[PDB]
Copies of this chain bind each other. A is one copy, B any other.
């Protein structure tokens, strides 16, 4: 059922291709091989499982160190006393999760100043272009997207963006949509999402993004080819992380509020058709259950899984994770299998949604203002490609689990 899932996902991409005959079998064959093998290595092979576990524990340690800054600012409100007083409601999201975005943004900026990020990206991106035949720039952007967000990753190849082929630009877009970022990864981890899955999905996003970019927009043209000190670097990162944290916080207040209002209205509207219990989650579960089943979620869990996967696609993954997180605790409304939890975790791990197009337009567009028309034109296809990559990663994860 998983292998059928993989075939259908690949087939959809081929059906949507700008030119199926231009599809490079080495590129897309190798890309799928890498995404599949990467998953096999770290989710199934003992030595790989241990490397993943080791990496994840380090990430967990870094998060905990960063929480010392949070503890200073908010004191008792992020202490154990909160759970005694308020019970479950003692976990204040605004103080527990959002500040991690600030710390990690500062850390990443420091690692860029020190040249550490560039070193890792150069190695991974180099391996990708040699194996796949993808261009230098698009391969580096794909690798950068493992660690940073869709508008930050292309910065490592910013002078090459204005003259990128349409296929290159599309791949750059897909690499961002198929992945997340270090900051929010730590946020999702703080919400209870398994770090191993997040790290695995992040790394798998690089070949996965190239896979579906090159299936849906094969190359038909010919491609071509700093802060004053480390403290300034950290400060710049903290500032950017602050803006992100404020925006995420405002988005969540509004979007979760709007879903509640939508459910209030759907209840009244549904009542006209004998369904006063109608809610957005029900519509999404009903609509997306076949997709969840297709990627390997058991029949009796596909509807609940569909709620989260659907919400990620029609809104964004942060809102989706916010609703999925309770199902990872002991107080879960529905106790899901460990394979279903994993599949959902992987399928949600991406910036692939329609609103990300506007973000790419501004961020990626500022890097090449004459290409904004191209970005807008390819936006929906890029979101589909990114969605397919997330789904494929989830299917693969479901397979080896």
A interface vs B, CB < 8 Å? 61-62, 65-70, 72-77, 79, 81-82, 85-87, 89-94, 99, 102-103, 105-107, 110, 227-229, 231-232, 234-235, 237-239, 241-242, 245-247, 249-261, 263-264, 314-315, 322, 353-355, 357-358
B62 touches A76 (CB 8 A): no
| A241 proximity list for chain B (CB < 8 A) | 250, 254
A94 touches B74 (CB 8 A): yes
A257 touches B68 (CB 8 A): yes
B260 touches A68 (CB 8 A): yes
Q: Which of B72, B103, B358 contacts A228 (CB 8 A)?
A: B358
A254 touches B102 (CB 8 A): yes
Q: Tell which of A76, A99, A227, A251 has the most Cβ of chain B within 10 Å.
A: A76
A401 to chain B, nearest CB (A): 30
Question: How many copies of this chain are found per oligomer?
Answer: 3
22 interchain pairs (CB within 8 A)?
A62-B261, A69-B252, A69-B253, A73-B92, A75-B89, A75-B91, A75-B93, A76-B89, A79-B86, A79-B89, A81-B86, A102-B250, A103-B253, A103-B254, A103-B257, A105-B254, A107-B258, A227-B358, A234-B255, A238-B253, A238-B254, A242-B247
| A69 proximity list for chain B (CB < 8 A) | 252-258, 260
Q: Which of B86, B103, B257, B357 contacts A66 (CB 8 A)?
A: B257
| A264 proximity list for chain B (CB < 8 A) | 61, 65
| Assembly CA distance A75 to B261 (angstroms) | 19
| Assembly CA distance A86 to B80 (angstroms) | 10
A93 touches B66 (CB 8 A): no
| A263 proximity list for chain B (CB < 8 A) | 65
A231 touches B314 (CB 8 A): yes
A237 to chain B, nearest CB (A): 7
